Amino acid sequence: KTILQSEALQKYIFDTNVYPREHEQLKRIRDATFKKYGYRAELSVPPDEGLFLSMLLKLMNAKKTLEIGVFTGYSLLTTALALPHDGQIVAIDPNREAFEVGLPFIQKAGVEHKINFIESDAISVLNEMLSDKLKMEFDFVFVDADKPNYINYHEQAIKLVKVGGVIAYDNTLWYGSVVSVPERLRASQKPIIELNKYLASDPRIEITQISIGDGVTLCRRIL
Amino acid sequence: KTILQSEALQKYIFDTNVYPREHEQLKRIRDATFKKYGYRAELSVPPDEGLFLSMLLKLMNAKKTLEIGVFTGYSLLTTALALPHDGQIVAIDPNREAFEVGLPFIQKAGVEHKINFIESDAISVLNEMLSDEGKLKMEFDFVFVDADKPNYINYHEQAIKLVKVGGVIAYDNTLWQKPIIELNKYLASDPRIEITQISIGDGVTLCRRIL
Ligand SMILES: Nc1ncnc2c1ncn2[C@@H]1O[C@H](CSCC[C@H](N)C(=O)O)[C@@H](O)[C@H]1O
Ligand SMILES: Nc1ncnc2c1ncn2[C@@H]1O[C@H](CSCC[C@H](N)C(=O)O)[C@@H](O)[C@H]1O
Ligand SMILES: [Mg+2]
């Protein structure tokens, strides 16, 4: 899986610059995820994107983060390992079963204490955060869930992220189809095109769309 | 050029997510670069990589940077615009004529005061910095290496002493040929850095100094 010019080039990146520095428990998540899910393992953040997100989190000095869409936990464990010892993550996914595929390796990595996993749909949780008593504020928000709700998440996340914080959207080049379409991915083409147009014109954010993985768009909140 | 599956996909990134947000003086650098250097305009850091570097510098809170390889100044102006008002950039290139193509637009953007442009080969400039004991602890937050590929490993061993612990050295063109193959192996096995290779532009490898 790649949006690059060649699968060989994608493998060069993995072999040269990811797998030799990949945490062993991240490898364990990858192996377990393919064994259970087959091609659906491609739902995971790819390992080169993971390593990038890790250094991004370190460079921003992020400590409080929100993850919408957990699956078996590759990006969640990536995030927990990058954060300092007192980092805290709110991680939302209706599929607790997938989460428990990765949880033994999260536990082995010693970072379970950083994670608040919420088995729920994200819309209601983020609406409760906005409606809750306390001040929810995040350094970083990773949106990697159900694409038809991405614009809805944006309007929630732009209230919950700090000014100067980052909201990151995954899959924003969607197999190249934003410019094309593989028939089974057609349903998600429109919502990603819609999200791309929405972020492109948003004055409250600075953006960079990065041709890593299946496309990552970073949104730095400035208003 | 693009390392993506299709040129249409690359152009989509530019049209949708770069040009509507691109500083007008960066556009003017792009146009003047084609007018003077033609298809060597391709040597410039591409617009999507520009916004990426800009976002990196803002998130890092970078203030002092070093640029090796300037050409007509697209990445240099990108950097100057991302830095705070009191930011400083040291920019090294033997081609002063190319720099002076972009200079009017750097000046119109109001950021010329941030820039110390040095007309030289970078190896000797950096060796002089390493010799300058008195300013050795005046370190850079960010180093961008975008020059002559056969010297990249040499620049690494200089830059790793010039950048702060926790700062970043960024190598351009790491998905290029031999000096890049060698560089990629060298950084992969360097215990003094953490790395991430990003498939943007011609390939960018970020090196965060940890020792
Ligand atoms: N309404 C919703 N709210 C939150 N998550 C949802 C959701 N609907 C679907 N999802 C979840 O979105 C996930 C997308 S895959 C997430 C991949 C993950 N970031 C990783 O690196 O492994 C799926 O696990 C799915 O269960
Ligand atoms: N020994 C050397 N030291 C510093 N720069 C060098 C060099 N040898 C070649 N170069 C320069 O490296 C540059 C590469 S093109 C640089 C692109 C620039 N960052 C931009 O965005 O426009 C050329 O301008 C060339 O003059
Ligand atoms: Mg993903």
Author numbering:
A (entry chain A): 8 to 139, 142 to 189, 194 to 236
B (entry chain B): 8 to 183, 202 to 236
Give the authors' words.
To clarify the exact roles of these residues in substrate binding, we replaced SAH with SAM and then docked EGCG in the structure of CsFAOMT1. EGCG is embedded in a narrow and deep cleft formed by two α-helices, α3, and the bent α-helix α9, with both the A-ring and B-ring anchored through hydrogen bonds. Briefly, Y46 from α3 interacts with the 7-OH on the A-ring. For the B-ring, K156 and two residues from α9, R197 and S201, recognize 3′-, 4′- and 5′-OH, respectively. The exchange of a single residue in CsFAOMT1 (Y184) with the corresponding residue in CsFAOMT2 (R184) appears to be sufficient to confer apparent 4″-methyltransferase activity on CsFAOMT1, although the activity is much lower than that of CsFAOMT2.
Here, we identify two O-methyltransferases from tea plant: CsFAOMT1 that has a specific O-methyltransferase activity on the 3ʹʹ-position of EGCG to generate EGCG3′′Me, and CsFAOMT2 that predominantly catalyzes the formation of EGCG4″Me. To explain the specificity of CsFAOMT1 and CsFAOMT2, we crystallized both in the presence of EGCG and S-adenosyl-L-homocysteine (SAH), a by-product of the cofactor SAM and determined the structures at a resolution of 2.0 Å for CsFAOMT1 and 2.0 Å for CsFAOMT2. The structural overlap of the monomers of CsFAOMT1 and CsFAOMT2 revealed a root mean square deviation of 0.36 Å over the Cα atom of 190 aligned residues, with the most striking difference occurring in an α-helix (α9) near the substrate binding pocket.
